[PDB]
Swiss-Prot record, chain A:
The gene is FAM91A1. Belongs to the FAM91 family. It comes from the Eukaryota. The chain holds residues 376 to 824 of 838 of the full protein. One of its GO terms (cellular component) is trans-Golgi network. Component of the complex WDR11 composed of C17orf75, FAM91A1 and WDR11; FAM91A1 and WDR11 are required for proper location of the complex. Interacts with golgins GOLGA1 and GOLGA4 and with TBC1D23; interaction with golgins may be mediated by TBC1D23 and interaction with TBC1D23 recruits TBC1D23 to AP-1-derived vesicles. This is Protein FAM91A1.
UniProtKB/Swiss-Prot annotation, chain B:
Ubiquitous. This is WD repeat-containing protein 11. Involved in the Hedgehog (Hh) signaling pathway, is essential for normal ciliogenesis. Regulates the proteolytic processing of GLI3 and cooperates with the transcription factor EMX1 in the induction of downstream Hh pathway gene expression and gonadotropin-releasing hormone production. WDR11 complex facilitates the tethering of Adaptor protein-1 complex (AP-1)-derived vesicles. WDR11 complex acts together with TBC1D23 to facilitate the golgin-mediated capture of vesicles generated using AP-1. InterPro entries: WD40/YVTN_repeat-like_dom_sf (IPR015943), WD40_repeat_CS (IPR019775), WD40_repeat_dom_sf (IPR036322), WD40_rpt (IPR001680), WDR11 (IPR039694). It comes from the Eukaryota. It is found in: Cytoplasm, Cytoskeleton, Cilium basal body; Cytoplasm; Nucleus; Cytoplasm, Cytoskeleton, Cilium axoneme. It is linked to A chromosomal aberration involving WDR11 is found in a form of glioblastoma. Translocation t(10;19)(q26;q13.3) with ZNF320. A chromosomal aberration involving WDR11 is found in a form of Kallmann syndrome. Translocation 46,XY,t(10;12)(q26.12;q13.11). Changing F973L: In HH14; does not affect the subcellular location of the protein; decreases capacity to shuttle from cilium to nucleus; decreases GLI3 protein levels. The gene is WDR11. WD repeats lie at residues 52-101, 104-147, 292-327, 389-428, 484-523, 562-591, 593-633, 639-677, 739-786. Signal peptide: none annotated. Changing H555Q: In HH14; abolishes the interaction with EMX1; decreases capacity to shuttle from cilium to nucleus; decreases interaction with EMX1; decreases GLI3 protein levels.
Length: 314, 1038, 144
């Protein structure tokens, strides 16, 4: 049969219009029309050039390729929170949601200060943990994260809490923080050297994540935040994503190469994905239901400080 | 779950633009539509609401605390408010009871302000009565002192921070100066009036520079000097800038707080490091959105520390900004921390930046940066036309999880949830896009709300019905996809068991739904009578009754596919009659209420309650069903000024009323306004305010913190000391101590934090003036002798430099010959004879004063020497004094060799201020002491009553022993004991044979005060140190 | 010169004995100041009533004539104020100041410059050494 590449409207939003209008509503490109699609495509557009030309040759260590909004489902990263056989990516929708951000923080024990507020909550005073940061990352339920000045944040938060839940995360102590993505699965080369900016595969945060998340048969990237901008204590995990990320050309080449080298599409190696896929979902749904007594909305207030997740009183 | 009577405030009026004040007690008060609201800054929540005025409030001012505090005059809260009817009410915030009512004529009060000089009388208040009347009132008995009439239109007035006898008036024509203000007699005459070459917005003095005031203009700021009456500095904005709105001067540091039209707050600090005065912008904030409906009114700043600002917005939102320090003229950190050289730079503004200095003059220099951070935000009720609803009443089956939530509707689609015992907003959810018409509750946590859109040409209205769950916030449609063209919904009903639901339309028949299943149940046929009113039966089968437009009554029961309770039916009509139908009696009892059309009527929750509430067009009423009688009445115009929009029941003994001005009030059966007190109030987080405690506990807490090393160990709990009083007071003391900030607590638990810094820190917390000023001067001089804000309390060199800079600016901006005459006189008196000779030789060849003037420059150059031919110069100089001309002769005496003699003549003729200025600039620091000592005696006379200034002057002279003598004489044992201990530690005077009598007396007197207060551990400690005179206290106390 | 000086002293004493009003006291003071009698002039200056409008200038003049007995330091500003006083138009006060401070020859030159030759000759006869009076007598003769 065929292998499909699931995507979101973000790719469409970012002679092209002749099929762009069809993608807006129909979105049912076939291999016959992808021939003209490639010629029309001859940063967001540039990274699409390598992806389509990669899943036709080899990848059998011989199937038609289509483009839909089937034996293998491959998505990209990061899937926007607006929307979302084998599947190389998030299994349940909670993986591509805020609940997964809290889950990874809970297991690792290291992360930025987090404050998840329920819908309708009124803030009268700024929490003391957020009075030192110069920039804050604001994430709404279903929307995309953004960075806003800390000086004027109460007036924006109270207006944004009247529609959906808002997550509060510190971004930088003296300005805009530094974010670096590390592709996974990890090869044996980066587990031998010391801690440097070029080689960050020896952080203790990733060591715990490697033994519980099973980052050996899935692709994606891991983002680390550095608010002190080396030492291992200045980097903390920020987010975990699954799929083939399309936002830069450098990361796409490395991610795609890790697919045709480790063999994340061989049927012998794909049979291990089903066992891993059915294990992550159960643990995530148990953690979500644990702090709860499409994606269900939060009922209580959760705060993350000093590596301990608890209930914020007020 | 006890519920207390309280009210909620919403939006403000146009008459409350200038009704806000921040007192030294640490509380912020602003004027509502007809109420006074007191809120805190660090806590940011409502504390007490005041209700006595019958009209809008225009002015609110706090009391001034500039006096020694003792048992006779303890810490208390006093507030003054004025309305448009000419009524001034003195308030007691602690009890919420008025003390004095003042009314003269019926005109709005233009301005009211307290008197800062309150050494002899502490209850003096001055207010403006239109059109041209000013009256000095008494805040204790409401007795008029004197009344003065003018011939202008007075708008505002300001008091001189330095000279209590100077008063200034701002009129429509110009500015009027008064130099004879006194509480005993009214002003003599109109005074001096100056014309300005109408659009002035504010006229206030500068508390950082003497004889200086600022003029507020839309695009300019003018700084004027009194003795020259000329502008010495202008502050202007660029062409693409927002015009000014309000300026708030600073005291401890030479700075200005400015407010713009867009809501931006800017801070300007005087230039000090690298000819007119220049102010440089340091920190800026972010403006808010501007629309025709919302706009800022005014801002206030805290006077105790001046490190924060508060903004008041027309919608009822209060924004609190805080100033932070971190390490373009440079600014440097101050060497001295908390009086003397772990640190807390953010404690106050004086610890953030250094003292002012003259630019252009030659160790550690650390740059400092200032930024504004928003740390507080308060919200109020929305615009009027609410729709209120109450949660289901308490029962025996839901007592374990009951919560008295209140639901309030809004015309913008918002839902407001209150908890009704703490008075705090619980949740705020936006559901609909139009005005909410009605709210019904399906459970203790879930409820329904519906809204209708605007009618179209045909008349069909889109209908929106949503189901909301409070813990989650999910909103789901109930009916579903019913389209956007259908008859509107005006009322919905939910039965007692929350099982069945009814929806009624204008012409479409009635539709029954199921709450649990959320499905359509059964639909009436077309041949059905129209629905007017409907109600369920409180007593799987449920009965509901409805009446049609024809007056017929139909009883229908539902089994799957108007007031009523018990066995009594009550019906209303458009005339006002309230029929009382009973099922058992089968008898009709019609009682004509002689009122307007009845809107809606409801009974009281709880079984056995046969009382109801009836809402009319212009009031509400309470009736009894068992016996047909009347309980209480409320009429708009007779007893209550405001109207009523909606009524509801809170508990079996309280009711909820909604007013037209945007306020919700909870009353009793009598519906009589009560006096809410802060003692029974329950608060979520603690509030630090020593004034709320009893007078015997506020003083006890101060002594405990002042002497921290109790039995060696350091602690902030009373459990380690012996304090024989009741547990209720002890618990209150513990709560307040735990409310202190973490940084303040760390500073107290500091072994190297000396006593002098502790006195300053405690005084800052209590928000007093006299205590803070005394310790600031004493600490600086004690440290200096051990090794501009204050005019005459500075050093000789520091004072001299600023006067030289001051006279330089005056000489630059000379305009006429008369101004030149003053400048020449000043320069000769300061000793700059070299530069005065050339200025004197500039007189035109036409002036009639050319002959003396040319010879005066002739005299100054040849008189610079002082030999044996100087005796006759004094003789004629003293003769010139005797004939009337004083200042003209004092110039000659000081010019030759003799400044000390000139000072004595000035003091004899009554120019005390000028003599001190002359002695401070010139003369060595051996003869200047004698001049100031004579000035101290005059200030201590019973007719001058300025003993506060006399104490500070003695501290400057260094006569510490004299300060100790006078402090004990004025019954200041609390201050006297601390000063003696500090002087001994820093080595000011030793315990010798003649000084031991005073030291023993002060400790004994302080020990007696502690014993009367109740603190025994402090009494025994100080009595032991007393010695022979403390033996009697030890024998009787032990 | 001594004979004429003695006669001038005699007539000025006679005038001073019979002073009547303030209109003559000022003239007598001017004559005494130009005739060299400075020790006795200060007492006469310190006699004006306290209500007269010229009291302040008179007191200033008394203090100055007491103080200006020296002729060393700070004698340039006095020369400038004297010369521009002459320039402005008031000659009598200016020539009084010149004769007061340190010089009479320049005063005679300025007086003869403006055309008051008789007063200049009288001043040169009462004042000045006979070595410098010869020159002023010669220029007076030449003008005559």
């Amino acid at each position: 049969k065929r292998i499909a590449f699931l995507f979101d409207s973000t790719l469409t939003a970012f002679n092209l219009k002749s099929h762009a209008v069809t993608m807006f509503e129909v979105g049912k490109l076939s291999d016959e029309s992808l021939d003209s699609f490639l010629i029309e495509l001859e940063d967001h557009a540039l990274t699409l050039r390598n992806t389509i030309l990669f899943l036709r040759h080899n990848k059998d260590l011989g199937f038609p390729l289509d483009l839909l909004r089937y034996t293998l489902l491959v998505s990209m990263a990061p899937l926007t929170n607006e929307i979302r056989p084998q599947h190389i990516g998030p299994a349940i929708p909670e993986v591509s949601s805020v609940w997964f951000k809290l889950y990874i923080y809970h297991v690792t024990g290291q992360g930025p200060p987090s404050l998840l507020l329920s819908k309708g909550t009124r803030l009268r005073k700024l929490p003391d943990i957020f009075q030192s940061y110069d920039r804050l990352l604001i994430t709404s339920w279903g929307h995309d994260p953004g960075v806003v000045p800390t000086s004027n944040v109460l007036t924006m938060l109270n207006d944004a809490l009247t529609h959906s839940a808002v997550l509060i995360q510190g971004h930088g102590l003296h300005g805009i923080g530094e974010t670096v993505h590390v592709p996974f699965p990890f090869d044996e080369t980066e587990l031998q050297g010391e801690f440097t900016r070029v080689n960050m595969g020896v952080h203790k945060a990733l060591q715990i994540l490697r033994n519980r998340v099973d980052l050996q048969h899935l692709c994606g990237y891991v983002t680390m935040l550095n608010a002190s901008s080396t030492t291992e204590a200045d980097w903390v995990p920020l987010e975990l994503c699954f799929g083939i990320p399309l936002f830069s050309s450098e990361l796409n080449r490395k991610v795609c190469r890790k697919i045709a080298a480790h063999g994340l599409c061989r049927k012998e190696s794909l049979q291990n994905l089903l066992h891993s896929s059915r294990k992550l979902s159960l643990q995530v749904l148990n953690f979500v239901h644990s702090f709860q007594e499409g994606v269900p909305l939060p009922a209580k207030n959760l705060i993350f400080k000093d590596g301990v997740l608890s209930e914020w009183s007020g | 779950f006890k519920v207390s009577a309280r009210t909620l405030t919403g939006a403000l009026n146009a008459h409350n633009k200038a009704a806000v004040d921040w007192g030294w007690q640490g509380l912020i008060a602003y004027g509502c539509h007809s109420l006074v609201v007191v809120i805190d800054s660090i806590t940011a929540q409502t504390l007490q609401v005041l209700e006595k005025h019958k009209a809008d409030v225009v002015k609110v001012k706090w009391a001034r605390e500039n006096y020694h505090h003792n048992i006779g005059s303890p810490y208390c809260l006093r507030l003054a408010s004025a309305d448009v009817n000419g009524k001034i009410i003195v308030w007691d915030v602690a009890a919420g009871v008025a003390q004095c009512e003042i009314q003269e004529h019926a005109k709005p009060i233009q301005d009211v302000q307290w008197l800062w000089n309150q050494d002899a009388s502490r209850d003096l208040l001055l207010a403006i009565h239109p059109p041209n009347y000013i009256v000095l009132w008494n805040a204790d008995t409401g007795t008029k002192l004197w009344k003065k009439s003018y011939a202008d239109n007075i708008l505002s007035f300001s008091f001189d921070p330095f000279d209590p006898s100077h008063l200034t008036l701002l009129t429509s024509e110009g500015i009027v100066f008064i130099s004879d203000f006194s509480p005993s007699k009214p002003p003599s005459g109109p005074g001096k009036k100056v014309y300005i070459s109408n659009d002035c917005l504010q006229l206030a003095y500068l508390p950082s520079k003497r004889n200086h005031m600022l003029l507020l203009y839309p695009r300019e700021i003018l700084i004027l000097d009194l003795e020259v009456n000329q502008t010495v500095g202008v502050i202007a904005i660029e062409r693409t800038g927002v015009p000014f709105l309000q300026v708030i001067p600073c005291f401890q540091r030479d700075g200005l707080f400015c407010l713009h039209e867009n809501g931006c707050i800017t801070l300007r600090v005087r230039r000090s490091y690298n000819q007119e005065l220049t102010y440089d912008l340091r920190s800026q904030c972010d403006a808010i959105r501007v629309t025709k409906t919302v706009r800022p009114f005014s801002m206030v700043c805290c006077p105790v520390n001046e490190n924060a600002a508060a903004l008041v917005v027309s919608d009822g939102r209060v924004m609190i900004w805080e100033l932070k320090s971190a390490v373009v003229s440079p600014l440097y950190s101050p060497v001295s921390f908390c009086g003397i050289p772990n640190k807390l730079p953010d404690l106050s503004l004086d610890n953030m930046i250094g003292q002012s200095a003259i630019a252009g003059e030659e160790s550690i220099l650390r740059e400092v940066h200032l930024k504004f951070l928003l740390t507080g935000l308060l919200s109020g009720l929305p615009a009027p036309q609410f729709a209120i609803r109450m949660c289901p009443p308490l029962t025996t089956k839901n007592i374990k999880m009951y919560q008295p939530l209140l639901a309030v509707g809004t015309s913008n689609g918002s839902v407001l949830v209150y908890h009704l015992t703490s008075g705090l907003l619980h949740k705020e959810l936006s559901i609909h896009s139009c005005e909410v018409k009605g709210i019904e509750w399906t459970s203790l946590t879930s409820f329904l709300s519906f809204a209708t859109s605007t009618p179209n040409n045909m008349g069909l209205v889109r209908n929106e019905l949503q189901l909301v769950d409070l813990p989650t916030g999910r909103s789901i449609a109930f009916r579903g996809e019913r389209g956007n063209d259908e008859s509107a919904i005006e009322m919905i009903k939910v039965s007692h068991l929350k099982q069945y639901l009814a929806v009624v339309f204008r012409d479409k028949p009635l539709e029954l739904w199921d709450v649990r299943t959320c499905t359509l149940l059964r639909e009436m046929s077309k041949n059905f009578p129209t629905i007017t009113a409907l109600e369920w039966s409180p007593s799987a089968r449920e009965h509901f009754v409805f009446t049609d437009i024809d007056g017929q009554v139909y009883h229908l029961t539902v089994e799957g596919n108007i007031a009523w309770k018990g066995d009594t039916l009550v019906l209303g009509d458009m005339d006002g009659n309230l029929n009382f139908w009973d099922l058992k009696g089968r008898v009709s009892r019609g009682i004509p209420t002689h009122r307007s059309w009845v809107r809606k009527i409801r009974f009281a929750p709880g079984k056995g309650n046969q009382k109801l509430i009836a809402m009319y067009n212009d009031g509400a009423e309470v009736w009894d069903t068992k016996e047909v009688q009347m309980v209480s009445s409320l009429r708009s115009g007779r007893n209550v000024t405001f109207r009523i929009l909606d009524v509801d029941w809170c508990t079996s003994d309280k009711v909820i009323l909604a007013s037209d001005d945007g306020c919700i009030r909870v009353l009793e059966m009598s519906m009589k306004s009560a006096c809410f007190r802060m003692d029974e109030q329950e608060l979520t987080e603690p509030v630090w305010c020593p004034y709320l405690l009893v007078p015997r506990a506020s003083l006890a807490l101060k002594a405990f913190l002042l002497h921290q090393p109790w039995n060696g160990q350091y602690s902030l709990d009373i459990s380690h000391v012996d304090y024989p009083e009741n547990e209720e007071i002890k618990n209150l003391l513990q709560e307040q101590l735990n409310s202190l900030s973490n940084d303040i607590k760390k500073l107290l638990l500091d072994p190297e934090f000396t006593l002098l810094q502790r006195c300053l820190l405690v005084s800052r917390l209590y928000g007093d003036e006299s205590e803070l000023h005394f310790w600031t001067v004493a600490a600086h001089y004690l440290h200096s002798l051990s090794q501009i804000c204050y005019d005459v309390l500075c050093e000789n060199a520091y004072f001299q430099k600023f006067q030289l800079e001051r006279v330089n600016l005056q000489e630059v901006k000379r305009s006429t010959y008369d101004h030149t005459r003053k400048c020449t006189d000043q320069l000769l008196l300061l000793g700059q004879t070299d530069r005065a000779v050339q200025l004197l030789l500039e007189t035109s060849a036409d002036n009639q004063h050319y002959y003396c003037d040319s010879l005066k420059a002739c005299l100054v150059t040849t008189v610079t020497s002082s030999g044996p031919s100087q005796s006759t110069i004094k003789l004629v100089a003293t003769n010139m004094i005797a004939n009337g001309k004083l200042a003209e002769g004092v110039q000659l005496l000081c010019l030759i060799d003799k400044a000390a003699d000139a000072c004595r003549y000035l003091q004899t003729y009554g120019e005390w201020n000028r003599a001190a200025w002359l002695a401070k600039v010139r003369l060595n620091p051996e003869e200047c002491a004698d001049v100031l000592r004579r000035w101290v005696d005059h200030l201590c006379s019973p007719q001058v009553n300025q003993k506060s200034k006399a104490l500070l002057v003695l501290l400057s002279l260094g006569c510490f022993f004299s300060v100790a003598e006078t402090l004990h004489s004025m019954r200041y044992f609390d201050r006297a004991a601390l000063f003696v201990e500090a002087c001994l530690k820093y080595g000011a005077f030793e315990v010798t044979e003649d000084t031991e009598k005073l030291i023993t007396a002060i400790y004994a007197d302080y020990a007696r005060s502690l014993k009367n207060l109740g603190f025994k551990q402090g009494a025994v400690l100080f009595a032991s140190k007393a010695g022979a005179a403390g033996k009697d206290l030890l024998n009787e106390l032990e």
